[PDB]
Amino acid sequence: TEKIICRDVARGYENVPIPCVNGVDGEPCPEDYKYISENCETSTMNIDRNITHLQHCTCVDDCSSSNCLCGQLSIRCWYDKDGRLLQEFNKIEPPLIFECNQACSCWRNCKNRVVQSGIKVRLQLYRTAKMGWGVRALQTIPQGTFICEYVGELISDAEADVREDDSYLFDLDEVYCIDARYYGNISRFINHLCDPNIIPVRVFMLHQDLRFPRIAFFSSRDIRTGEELGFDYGDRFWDIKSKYFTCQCGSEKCKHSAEAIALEQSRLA
Amino acid sequence: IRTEKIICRDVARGYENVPIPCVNGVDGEPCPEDYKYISENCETSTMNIDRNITHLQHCTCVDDCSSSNCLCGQLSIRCWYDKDGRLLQEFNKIEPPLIFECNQACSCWRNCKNRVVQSGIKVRLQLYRTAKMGWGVRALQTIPQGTFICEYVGELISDAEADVREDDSYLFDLDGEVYCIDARYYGNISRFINHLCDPNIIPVRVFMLHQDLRFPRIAFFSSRDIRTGEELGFDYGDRFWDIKSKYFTCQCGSEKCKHSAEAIALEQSRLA
Numbered sequence A: 001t002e003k004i005i006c007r008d009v010a011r012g013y014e015n016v017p018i019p020c021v022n023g024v025d026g027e028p029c030p031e032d033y034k035y036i037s038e039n040c041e042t043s044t045m046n047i048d049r050n051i052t053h054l055q056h057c058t059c060v061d062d063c064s065s066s067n068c069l070c071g072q073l074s075i076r077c078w079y080d081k082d083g084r085l086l087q088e089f090n091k092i093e094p095p096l097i098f099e100c101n102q103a104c105s106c107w108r109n110c111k112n113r114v115v116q117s118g119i120k121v122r123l124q125l126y127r128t129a130k131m132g133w134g135v136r137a138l139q140t141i142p143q144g145t146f147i148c149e150y151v152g153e154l155i156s157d158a159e160a161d162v163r164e165d166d167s168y169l170f171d172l173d174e175v176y177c178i179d180a181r182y183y184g185n186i187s188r189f190i191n192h193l194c195d196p197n198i199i200p201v202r203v204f205m206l207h208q209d210l211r212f213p214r215i216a217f218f219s220s221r222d223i224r225t226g227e228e229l230g231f232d233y234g235d236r237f238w239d240i241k242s243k244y245f246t247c248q249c250g251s252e253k254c255k256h257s258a259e260a261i262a263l264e265q266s267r268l269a
Numbered sequence B: 001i002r003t004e005k006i007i008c009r010d011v012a013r014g015y016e017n018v019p020i021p022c023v024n025g026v027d028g029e030p031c032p033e034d035y036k037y038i039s040e041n042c043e044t045s046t047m048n049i050d051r052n053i054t055h056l057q058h059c060t061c062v063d064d065c066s067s068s069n070c071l072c073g074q075l076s077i078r079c080w081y082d083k084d085g086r087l088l089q090e091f092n093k094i095e096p097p098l099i100f101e102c103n104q105a106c107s108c109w110r111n112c113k114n115r116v117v118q119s120g121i122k123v124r125l126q127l128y129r130t131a132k133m134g135w136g137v138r139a140l141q142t143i144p145q146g147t148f149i150c151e152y153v154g155e156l157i158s159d160a161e162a163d164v165r166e167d168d169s170y171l172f173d174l175d176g177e178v179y180c181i182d183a184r185y186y187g188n189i190s191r192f193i194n195h196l197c198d199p200n201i202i203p204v205r206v207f208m209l210h211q212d213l214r215f216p217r218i219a220f221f222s223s224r225d226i227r228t229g230e231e232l233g234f235d236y237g238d239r240f241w242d243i244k245s246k247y248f249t250c251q252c253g254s255e256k257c258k259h260s261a262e263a264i265a266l267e268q269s270r271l272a
């Protein structure tokens, strides 16, 4: 039987609660990390927060016209009137998104502020059959909807190079990383799928320091209620981890299962 | 003859929890636009604020932070907020302590009892044209003593930078090296609050997402019950008036006014 073990893993820091349930095993709600809703720093990074360094728009409407400078910074604003990615949006090679900011002339409710407005969908941390904890939707989610941000500890690549536990690392684009092992949000629990239903997009909001894009997950297709969320962790992850464990996503397109790995090595010979 | 007109529906452009409208029933001055409204402090040079999460003092509370064991409350002797978010009656309004609110490192939840200022504006205010002092800010409702009103928000600048700025009419001094909040070019609603010699709000230094003591955030709390329609005002202090008295005098109208033309003249006469 599935029981609601924690009413909100985010401790009230998100717009909506994120409960945790486990109907698979005896594992209690995870507590070996610190939930944070926004990225943190553990060393001197000096993110460029100078307000005069922000590119910004002069719109006095809702930023829905093609004349919005912030939209032009990403070719065009990719958000429709409902805050969802346009359907033409390149989900294979996503552009950088520049949302409106505190230097823009527009109001806080304009159409170019989806990610900075936070989580709106109902998500749940749940125990999966084969992959530990995972995150699933508690509602239908149309294609192009903002889900959540990959939040954690900002670290340099040199620091990432010496960290033991690399299971919760997201590479940003000298390069930096978000390590969600010790400090992270709900995204640290999202598993890898070889047939993913969310995609990461690099976004700029209150600063435009190009070393530190913020990573926003949007649905790449319609997601049904109860479906597990997953993104493609990529080849760096799997080149490292395949020798320790194999993919359990179960897709017919799986490239990282024990079977898939074995079939590739057999054709080598 | 002259009617009160609503000139701006919200000077904050939706950035606060509530709209802050602007009205004028005094003169023909339109909504002020010679500044940029920001709801949080901005930086225009490298300030190197200590934002390292491991440097935060934080509590281990598993309740709502109402117990005497909350470290964050202990950092100010005690938590000074009652269950409704208002300062205790014993709060020292003459020399207020530093307040350390709970933060992202504390074990407690976002709704604990020690998070008043970080939750933003809750009272209903209005920017309005005063009779003698330009724009001012007044209450649209009764406000009990001890209630958080708004933060003094603007551009963080060094003492050396403040020393070279022409317009010093919107400066709040923070105090090693010293910093200032300049609300002339970037500011929130607080930039429009006038000076009162009998003030009804007091500034309190508060720490929230960081604890870099060079950069307290300035929170105004009511020092007494405030009536509907009453203009808000704080004591700008002697540095302001030592500079400005030669250009204009106080129009607050209090019998206790210490900066009016009359008060200045009576001091000149007592020398002679």
Ligand SMILES: CCCN(C)c1nc(NC2CCN(C)CC2)c2cc(OC)c(OC)cc2n1
Pocket (backbone or CB within 6 Å): A157, A158, A160, A161, A162, A163, A164, A166, A167, A169, A170, A171, A175, A177, A233, A234, A236, A237, A238, A240, A241
């Ligand atoms: C420029 C790349 C930033 N760097 C250094 C890095 N390092 C990883 N891992 C190791 C960390 C420990 N050292 C002993 C060797 C390298 C790593 C592992 C990832 O997933 C298993 C991953 O997934 C997206 C990204 C990763 N990124």
Ligand SMILES: CCCN(C)c1nc(NC2CCN(C)CC2)c2cc(OC)c(OC)cc2n1
Pocket (backbone or CB within 6 Å): B158, B159, B162, B163, B164, B165, B166, B168, B169, B171, B172, B173, B174, B175, B178, B179, B180, B236, B237, B239, B240, B241, B243, B244
């Ligand atoms: C930490 C910053 C300390 N500093 C430098 C400062 N300077 C002010 N003014 C002047 C600026 C132009 N220089 C040529 C001379 C000094 C000044 C004026 C204030 O109100 C009229 C005030 O009110 C609270 C605070 C002020 N603070």
Ligand SMILES: C[S@@+](CC[C@H](N)C(=O)[O-])C[C@H]1O[C@@H](n2cnc3c(N)ncnc32)[C@H](O)[C@@H]1O
Pocket (backbone or CB within 6 Å): A130, A131, A132, A133, A134, A167, A168, A188, A189, A190, A191, A192, A193, A241, A245, A246, A247, A248, A249
């Ligand atoms: C960022 S975490 C995801 C949350 C994790 N399941 C947990 O319980 O904390 C990454 C780890 O989840 C597991 N995992 C994620 N995707 C997987 C997959 N497709 N197949 C097998 N294990 C997976 C692996 O242990 C991986 O190192």
Ligand SMILES: C[S@@+](CC[C@H](N)C(=O)[O-])C[C@H]1O[C@@H](n2cnc3c(N)ncnc32)[C@H](O)[C@@H]1O
Pocket (backbone or CB within 6 Å): B132, B133, B134, B135, B136, B169, B170, B191, B192, B193, B194, B195, B196, B244, B248, B249, B250, B251, B252
């Ligand atoms: C920070 S501003 C306050 C908002 C200002 N009234 C406005 O219209 O922008 C400070 C200036 O307001 C005016 N002021 C504020 N308090 C005053 C007072 N008690 N008596 C006369 N003028 C005052 C002076 O011009 C002063 O330099």
Ligand SMILES: [Zn+2]
Pocket (backbone or CB within 6 Å): A057, A058, A059, A062, A063, A067, A068, A069, A070, A071, A100, A104, A106
């Ligand atoms: Zn715009």
Ligand SMILES: [Zn+2]
Pocket (backbone or CB within 6 Å): A057, A059, A062, A063, A100, A101, A104, A106, A107, A110, A111, A112
């Ligand atoms: Zn906009």
Ligand SMILES: [Zn+2]
Pocket (backbone or CB within 6 Å): A056, A057, A058, A063, A068, A069, A070, A099, A100, A101, A104, A105, A106, A112
């Ligand atoms: Zn904009």
Ligand SMILES: [Zn+2]
Pocket (backbone or CB within 6 Å): A193, A194, A195, A247, A248, A249, A250, A251, A253, A254, A255, A256, A257
């Ligand atoms: Zn797979």
Ligand SMILES: [Zn+2]
Pocket (backbone or CB within 6 Å): B059, B060, B061, B064, B065, B069, B070, B071, B072, B073, B102, B106, B108
């Ligand atoms: Zn506490």
Ligand SMILES: [Zn+2]
Pocket (backbone or CB within 6 Å): B059, B061, B064, B065, B102, B103, B106, B108, B109, B112, B113, B114
């Ligand atoms: Zn607390």
Ligand SMILES: [Zn+2]
Pocket (backbone or CB within 6 Å): B058, B059, B060, B065, B070, B071, B072, B101, B102, B103, B106, B107, B108, B114
């Ligand atoms: Zn605390």
Ligand SMILES: [Zn+2]
Pocket (backbone or CB within 6 Å): B196, B197, B250, B251, B252, B253, B254, B256, B257, B258, B259, B260
């Ligand atoms: Zn006065």
